[PDB]
Structures are given as C-alpha cells and as structure tokens.
Amino acid sequence: MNLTELKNTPVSELITLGENMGLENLARMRKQDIIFAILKQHAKSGEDIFGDGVLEILQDGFGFLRSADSSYLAGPDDIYVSPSQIRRFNLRTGDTISGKIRPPKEGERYFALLKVNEVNFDKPENARNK
Numbered sequence: 001m002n003l004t005e006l007k008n009t010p011v012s013e014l015i016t017l018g019e020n021m022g023l024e025n026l027a028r029m030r031k032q033d034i035i036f037a038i039l040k041q042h043a044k045s046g047e048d049i050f051g052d053g054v055l056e057i058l059q060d061g062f063g064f065l066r067s068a069d070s071s072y073l074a075g076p077d078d079i080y081v082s083p084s085q086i087r088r089f090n091l092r093t094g095d096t097i098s099g100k101i102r103p104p105k106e107g108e109r110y111f112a113l114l115k116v117n118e119v120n121f122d123k124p125e126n127a128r129n130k
Contacts, residue, residue, distance in 0.1 A: 001042060003051045003101075003111075006035040007077060014038060021045065032076050039101075039111065051079035051113065052098035055091055065097060065113065080110040089116055089124040096120060 009017060014034040015026035021041035026034050039049050056074070057063040063086060065079035079101060081091075091097065102114035116124040 001038075001047065001049050003035065003049075003077060003079065004053065006038060007031070035077060048100060050098065050100045050117070051111070052118075053079070053096075055081055055086070055093055055095045055097055057086065057093040063093065064110070074110075076110075078110065080104075080112040082112065085113050085116075089119055090126075091119060 006014065011031040011034060014031055015023075015029065018024070018026045018029075018034055018037050018041065021038065023034075023037050023041055026037065029037070043049055051065055053065045054068045055063050055065050056070070056078075061083045063081045063083075064074040065081055066075055066077075085091070096119070097116065098118040099113055100115040100117070101111045104112045
C-alpha cells in the first residue's frame with residue numbers, strides 16, 4: 001500500500017499485519033524488512049502498493065522520493081527514481097509527487113517508482129511549451 005502508511009504502523013503493528021497475510025514469527029524482524037515483506041505479500045495477494053513525498057535528485061542522474069527534510073543521502077525505506085522517470089515528466093528535486101511502485105530486477109535492493117499519479121500539483125505532461 002502507501003509506504004508512508006506502512007511506516008505509520010509501529011513495528012509490532014507491521015508484524016501483526018504480516019501475520020494477517022501469513023507472515024508469522026516476524027517479531028525477530030525489523031520494521032524495515034517487515035514492511036518489505038508486507039509489500040511482497042500484499043502484492044502477491046494482488047493489492048496495490050504506492051509511494052509519495054518530495055523527490056531528491058543525485059549528481060549520478062537518478063534520484064529518490066521520500067519525506068521533505070534532506071539528510072543529503074537517501075534512506076532505506078525511501079523510493080528509487082530513474083532519470084527517464086524524472087526526464088519523462090519534467091520533474092525536479094524537491095518536487096511533490098505520488099505514484100505506484102515496482103521492483104526492477106535482481107539489482108533491486110530499493111523499490112523503484114513505476115506509475116505517476118500526481119506531480120507538482122499538475123499532470124505528468126502539458127502542451128504550452130516555454
């Protein structure tokens with residue numbers, strides 16, 4: 001579901017949510033990995049999961065979505081964001097965005113943005129040129 005919502009669930013509430021999905025014995029798991037599990041099990045079950053916040057660009061040409069503070073680096077529960085994604089809808093660091101998420105390939109480690117639902121209080125496109 002919404003990653004920020006997952007974090008809104010205390011580690012114990014995240015393990016009880018996994019138990020509801022069959023993931024039991026998570027008491028030994030940290031809120032980070034337990035959320036990643038709720039993403040794999042609610043997705044397997046076919047539920048939708050999405051991320052949201054304010055993007056952060058990286059000199060490397062890719063960036064991550066997350067809260068509004070900075071910290072300079074990313075975070076484990078943040079969101080991965082490719083350039084084609086930023087470039088494709090004309091985004092910017094600090095931009096406000098919301099969307100669905102999906103895992104890339106074995107080189108996943110962080111989930112990646114997948115579909116855009118909202119961006120800079122505007123649609124992911126336009127038609128005036130400037």
